[PDB]
Design a protein around this ligand. Sequence first.
Ligand SMILES: CC1(C)Cc2cccc(C(N)=O)c2O1
Length: 266
Amino acid sequence: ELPEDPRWELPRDRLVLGKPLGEFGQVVLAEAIGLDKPNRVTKVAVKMLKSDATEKDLSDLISEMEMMKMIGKHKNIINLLGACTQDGPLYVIVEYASKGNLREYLQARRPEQLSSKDLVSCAYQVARGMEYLASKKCIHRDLAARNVLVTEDNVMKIADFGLLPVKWMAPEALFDRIYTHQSDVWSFGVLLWEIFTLGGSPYPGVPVELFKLLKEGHRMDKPSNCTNELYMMMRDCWHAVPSQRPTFKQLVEDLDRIVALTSNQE
Ligand SMILES: CC1(C)Cc2cccc(C(N)=O)c2O1
C-alpha cells in the first residue's frame, strides 16, 4: 500500500467529487477546498481507478503521478496539483480543462469561429508544451489533438504525456517501435494538420496499407485554407529522415514569428 509524500498529499475531505469527465480509469470534475494556502475552492480533474482494475492499472497510475512529479510545471501541459494516497483509493489530481480536447474544440468551431491567428496560436502553444517536455527528456509517444486539452481561458495543455493512433506515428515508431523526440515531431506535423482542417481525420479513406504508402513517400495534402509556410512545416515535420525534422525549439521560433505576422482581421 502507498507511501505518503507530503509534497502532494491533500486530505480526502478537501475534495468535493462532482460529475464524470471521461473514462482504463475514470476522471471526475471536483472542487478542491484550500489547495493554495485556504477557504477558496478550485475546480479540478481527479484521476482514479475504474471499479474492476488489476494491479497493472494501479501501478501505471502511480507511475504517471510519479512522472508528473519529476517533470515539473509548464503553462502548456496538464499539471499535477496533488493526490490522495492514504486511506482510500488513489486519486491523482490535475489541472482541469473546461473546454475539452482540441479535436472537439476545433470541430465545434467549424462554420464560435476561430480566427486565423487563433489557429496558429493554438499551434504555438502546443509546440511550447512539447518544447518543455522535450527539455525534460519526456517523450510523449501519442501526441495528437485528442490528447491536447483546452482550459476555460483557451490555453492549450498537453495531456497524457506521462503514461486509430497509428495514423499519428512516425514510420520508424510504426515499424521498429522506436520513439523519440523526433517521432513526436512527426506527430506534431499530423497535429498541425488537424488544426488547420479544424479537426479533420488524417488519411481519410486509407486503411491501416498506410505502412507501405508512407514508405513510398505518401504525404497528406495541404488543407484547404492553410498557408504554404505552414504546409511546409507539416512537411518538414514529416521528413523520412528523423535527424532531418525540425526540433520543438525551432518549431517554436518559427510559429512565434508566424503568429506575429498572421492577420488578426482574417
Ligand atoms: C487526465 C485527463 C488527461 C483525462 C481527462 C479527461 C477529461 C478532462 C480532463 C481534464 N483534466 O480537464 C482530463 O485530464
